[PDB]
Symmetry: D2
Subunit: 494 residues, 4 copies
């Protein structure tokens, strides 16, 4: 049941949001955001820079000041506000679902039923954490009373990617606002629209000004300015592992601000011989092709037991070949366009490599439309560990199927990586399930499923997949400062 | 590798322990504790009464007075004391292993390698909990500072059975002492020796007088006294499903003191068709025959799938037929005698019942010795739910094997009981394992194992199997009082 | 700013609520519920007995069936529904505020701005706990995977008082429904109306039938039946210190069900010489007189240091003499009538006793109106520890003001009580505030404030003040079953 | 009770510790360690470089290999070893305390009763954590079983400063080893000796080889090697606020490893007029002069209310004049030498700096002995906020006393700092303490005490005092990896 979408929704916000006010870039410069389906320009947006960031950072600090409305306000009320924002976004659910599809290109039915469901659940989840994250009282030695304060970290720099525009915004705002922090958020130049409108609903929710500031622009400028700002207490970056090094390097060189990173991966989806064929075939397909393959934890490495390899591939190629590519607003469409031309050509260049590298091209491999950034659902067979496509994150509709024999083999090959964001195991065996979920060096291991995220379930990565987690209770840690207060008492008793 | 035991351990203690001092029964009355292997008197024991109990409560009450050494005592020092006690106990491990065997009858190997092993770990485990059970600080509405204190409940009465004299003493003292309570313990008339000697080590450990008081005697008097005393803040009793209520009523009529209970069961052992036969066979035998059948969580109902019944049964009979019964001090001895004659004829009585009821006796079924309380390992086959041996806890080396076809059937038959202390499933299938562990109404579900107890692993029970928990972090709850302190402050800030 | 009250609200529910269906008593018997403002009979109400409780429990048990909608419901969905209930309550806030006044007598202004406010926040608070109450994974010894399940406890009997009809029901339902339990609630005969109407909203919110069953009636009939029921897993009773015991034996003598008690007290309010007169006096007045003095934790023992005693006493009388008593619906009315004649004659009888005992009657001491159950704000001075009025909870608008000299002294006298529900200390000294806050044997200690409850803050009592606590995260414990699942794994690694 | 020390303790360890083996530098290079009391060379010590570090890292990685002794080791057993290690350290308490003063310069009496006491307390505390850091089970939406695993981070690099050689080592090893990590530790060129001797005990303790590896040497070499190594999973650096920056970038450019920082401070000690003068003055002296001024959290900023300033100043200057400087092995000595010549000149330059700035030198201000790096207890008065001595951490026995008027004023002046490690308030008023403990922007606030550290008490910092904390349960956060495991289940039920 998905409400009919407005295929050309009108855009109301396209500037810089500061102190619950809409501003032009200081420079007066703007950038265009494009429809990835047509290549056409949707509209112009304010191009924020250092001076816009400072303005935003000045607004946040003063809103984070002791005695300020936001700082004094009940922890319970912060959650009421978060619930309100949830209420209003739901009110604007059909519109936002269409605008997200318009700028990002993901099919509307997904935008409505998945992305916007997940946004509502995440904000409502964190509303419930607002007054339920407690510090401790500590039975310290001697005649002393010791307790801890879990205060907000402060002015939080937040940079999010384009693959899940709205839900990334929610994943960040949730714990930061539930914990009493203020935010200056940097949104992706490819998909800044839905976040700019939500800032409107942030305003409509009742949130005081300066608590959430969004500065649209470009990474190296706005993004870098935040990463370098001397009055920013923490920066959360989600995006290319390349810029990540940039963020951490600038961060130590600015003020030693608190830095958490959530980068890419090359997630292994391991199908053991005793797996349910039909189910593993469909979850494997979803695992890689979901969101036009542009998922942090896409199952881009399909290991299949040799005894079943041929059948699995067969069904996967059949499955892949049936995937409907086209208008995201068309109910039948399973896959919309790639986010942008650069990414578009990047994936094509990967496929090209895969071919020359010797991987067996079984289907797709080229452009799926003369218009927009469409790429055919591509499946490579007989993929090797050394192949470029089997090592580098493609972030596209390119499926990699590797052949293995034993469980000891797949663990080492799966774990032989610089990444460790996610992984999955398909098997009926209890000991196989447990062996693997323990042995795989991943921040998330799915068993007989894939891409199952819960508002209560954390999402963190290992190795070069970064640090820190998202969702669940763990999220509140990186947005909180712990203060210990140890008071001298007349005489301690148990 | 077990050190040669003293088959004739000398007993140093047989009096009443109050305020780190040994007292004579106020009545001057004593009773004999007897070796279940020979049936002769070990020694005379002070027979505590109400008058001795009152002494103990008064001694305890004073040790818990605000400002006392124990109450002013550092939380971490509390752990050192239990850790010291552990260290003292290890020093006397060989001595204590002999004494427990002498009074209880369990093989010296098990006493040394199992029972005492878990005593050290329980005490060492809870020693680490002493200063790590935190209170909270709560982001309450209004300009207030709210935090909780986890205070000791106060004077705690503890009644423990005879099947695990030392381990039970440790399960109870573990959470009690680490969390700062004081204790008046009543030990089993059948097995008082090891507990009395341990009180002595507590003396040497450095525990302030009154902190632990032990009053040997019988239930209706001593036990009743603790249960009825109007200055007893808590009473922890483990044992008969019958007497437990007496506690709930006797205490619920006195001063509404805290009562948690850990009572008997009829725990079902479910063997699925795809389980490892050899493993299942040896585990099922252990699950029921462990500690001469004298276990609360004995797998007293072995459910076996039709497809594997015959082979499982055959394998079961030989294993039991091979089980070595005799002098507990014999290295080769697998099973000692029942704790006393009352138990011995009682179990004899049950075996008889099955025979009449039509259960197929497959082995054992009679007395294995003309001296001591030895009973033959016995196996009943083709057992049906409605039989008495399938309904009442036998607490002896009598095995019940039931046959089933579907998992939905065994779920219902397994759950159709007044008990719910534990349960087990043996299977290689993941989905069965998850299904059964969830569907089963038991406090503890073992999968592909049995009697797997962790000091860190909690021990609770459903229905009439008792309330409250033992072991793990959950144990400290029942021995802690939560006091909320709410403070007015100038101006509340996040 | 309170909306105009409807002094004669219509009654829409007055029967027995089972399976979201309205039923008459099996016997078809009914009882009258009275307006304490006129004494006149408001309406007739179904008189539930054992037979009706059998009905409800059978509906509850079936609602708790494994595979049932309530059992299968997303934990997050349980939270959505509690939020739905609060929303519908908010829509009917003015109505419920008026029916609560008519049935109970409490001032309309208080019912609206306090009672239903706290009702709404409590429900919204626990809605957020719904999917945040986690079990643990345990690093147990050996090659095992051990974790716990925090399952619902099951069929929960809830017997609630009349002093906070709506808040009490919300206080019980919140955590219970949040942990996935099903409820059979016994409401006060004096106050059945507002809770029955909520029953309508429970149905309207979307709760599956049989998840909540409310059987209004009388204690010895309805109440005892619940307390003795063999298929009830837990009984939560709140009220009379006398009746509480009936519960503990009835349940301990029934099926070993889990039993929580919430009984009265005689909470000491300690005012030190260096306290703020203005603040202390106004709080000391509030502490006892709130809700017509019918609060379990009312500060019925006012200790005032000798140096400030007289000035305080003088001011307290003036304050109470000025307290406006009358029509609860009048904005200027400060104190309405007592809940009923039973309570009415009871407290007069207590005033009588206090006179005979030699307590200094300083104001009031009699009837405040010829119609209804109004009693004058009463103040007794020079109260002594041995006096009846200083030992038994009056639950009326009767204030006791005692004299003391040292901080060492008031602690002994304050803790010299059978109860331990609440306490308070008023002072500007840090060491005095900490010293007393620790040494006071009460589940709740207020500093420079009184009756400060946060839904996030637990509410429990010491000694004979009952067990467990209400509100907070500790509130989820009493409605949870801990299941331990320990699984054998190929090879354990850190 | 202090045992007389060995004033010329023998050195038994002086090389590089890898896999429980003592090795020479690859280069065979050594460096001399100096006695800061005599200025003479104590002995030669192996000078590790990149190559020696690479060896240690591989040996660390090897001990962390899945299926290794340390990885298979029971969490509770991990605790036995830490408890064992502490035991061995206690046994060598007098020797290690002598060596620390010899190498560090702090008074033996303090080394013995403070540092080594604290070292023991840290180890035994974290021993009890080993098996108490639980993961959680999470009520995720859908038919799934979701849980998280808290695995070790891996190879943990630890660079420690010289002011608390043994205590700093413990603070790092404790949490690291309790959670199952392996260590490659860099000890200070000034104070490598006692840390090396412990390595010997670690072996006698029984830790599997490679679990802890200690590399003596220099910062630009060993430290930089560790921070840049591609196989070190996390780097924790403690020391110079300047160097702290170098680590974060090298780590950002190396392998994006986890980096926690603990830098310098300029902690404000705020004395209110109503504080206890005598207590305040002796604590204020201690707050700064402890450990020859060489504490990151030194009360280097003493704010005194104008009404009591003159007397406080009067009292503090005398107190310092009476402070004994000399041979740390002489019991009467309160203050030994600074750690070295670098530190020695640094403090002289700072004392000169304040002199030039116009700060009133009230006592000391020069060299205190011709031999070794002894410096006169120095007290500056009428210090202004803009002065360098009021802004930069001197890390010497140099006291700065500032004057203030109101509580709101000192709050802004105190918080106006790049540091936020600690703070303290002296007052008898409840509202002032609570107001200030909340408003002070510090990782740790003391009330009426200073330098009160408990193993159970977390130790972190605000602003440019670094990230992450030490001690408490919060100390384990940095040494833990969170893995979420999400399993498809037949049908989820509560």
């Amino acid at each position: 049941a998905v409400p009919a979408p407005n295929q050309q929704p009108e855009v109301f916000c396209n500037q810089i949001f500061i102190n619950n006010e809409w501003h032009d870039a200081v420079s007066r410069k703007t950038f265009p955001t494009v429809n990835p389906s047509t290549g056409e320009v949707i509209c112009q947006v304010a191009e924020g820079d250092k001076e816009d960031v400072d303005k935003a950072v000045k607004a946040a600090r003063a809103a984070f000041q002791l005695g300020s409305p936001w700082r004094r306000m009940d922890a319970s009320h912060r959650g009421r506000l978060l619930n309100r924002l949830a209420d209003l976004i739901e009110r604007d659910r059909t519109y936002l679902a269409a605008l997200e599809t318009l700028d990002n290109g993901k099919p509307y039915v997904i935008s409505y039923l998945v992305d916007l469901d997940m946004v509502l659940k995440c904000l409502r989840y964190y509303a419930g954490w607002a007054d339920k994250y407690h510090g401790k009282t500590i039975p310290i030695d001697g005649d002393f009373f010791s307790y801890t304060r879990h205060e907000p970290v402060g002015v939080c720099g937040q940079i999010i990617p384009w693959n899940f525009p709205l839900l990334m915004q929610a994943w960040k705002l949730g714990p930061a606002l539930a914990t009493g922090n203020v935010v200056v958020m940097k949104v992706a130049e490819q998909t800044p629209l839905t976040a700019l409108y939500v800032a409107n609903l942030i305003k409509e929710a009742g949130f005081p000004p300066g608590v959430v500031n969004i500065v649209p622009g470009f990474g190296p400028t706005a993004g870098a300015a935040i990463a370098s700002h001397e009055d920013v207490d923490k920066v959360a970056f989600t995006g290319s592992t390349e810029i990540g090094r940039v963020i951490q390097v600038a961060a130590g060189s600015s003020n030693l601000k608190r830095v958490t990173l959530e980068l890419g991966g090359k997630s292994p989806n391991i199908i053991m011989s005793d797996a349910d064929m039909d189910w593993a075939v469909e979850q494997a397909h979803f695992a890689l092709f979901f969101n036009q393959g542009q998922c942090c934890c896409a199952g881009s490495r399909t290991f299949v037991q040799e005894d079943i390899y041929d059948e699995f591939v067969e069904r996967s190629v059949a499955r892949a070949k049936s995937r409907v590519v086209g208008n995201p607003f068309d109910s039948k469409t399973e896959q919309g366009p790639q986010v942008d031309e650069t990414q578009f050509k990047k994936i094509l260049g990967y496929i090209n490599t895969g071919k020359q590298e010797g991987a067996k091209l079984l289907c797709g491999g080229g452009i799926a439309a003369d218009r927009g950034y469409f790429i055919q659902p591509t499946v490579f067979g007989d993929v090797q560990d050394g192949m470029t496509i089997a090592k580098e994150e493609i972030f596209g509709p390119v499926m990699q199927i590797l052949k293995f024999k034993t469980i000891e083999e797949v663990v080492g090959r799966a774990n032989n990586s610089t990444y460790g964001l996610a992984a999955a195991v398909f098997t009926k065996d209890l000991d196989k399930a447990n062996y693997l979920s323990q042995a795989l060096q991943a921040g998330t291991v799915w068993v007989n499923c894939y891409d199952v995220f819960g508002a209560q379930s954390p999402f963190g990565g290992y190795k070069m997949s970064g640090s820190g987690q998202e969702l669940g209770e763990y999220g509140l840690q990186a947005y909180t400062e712990v203060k210990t207060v140890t008071v001298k008492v007349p005489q301690k008793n148990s």
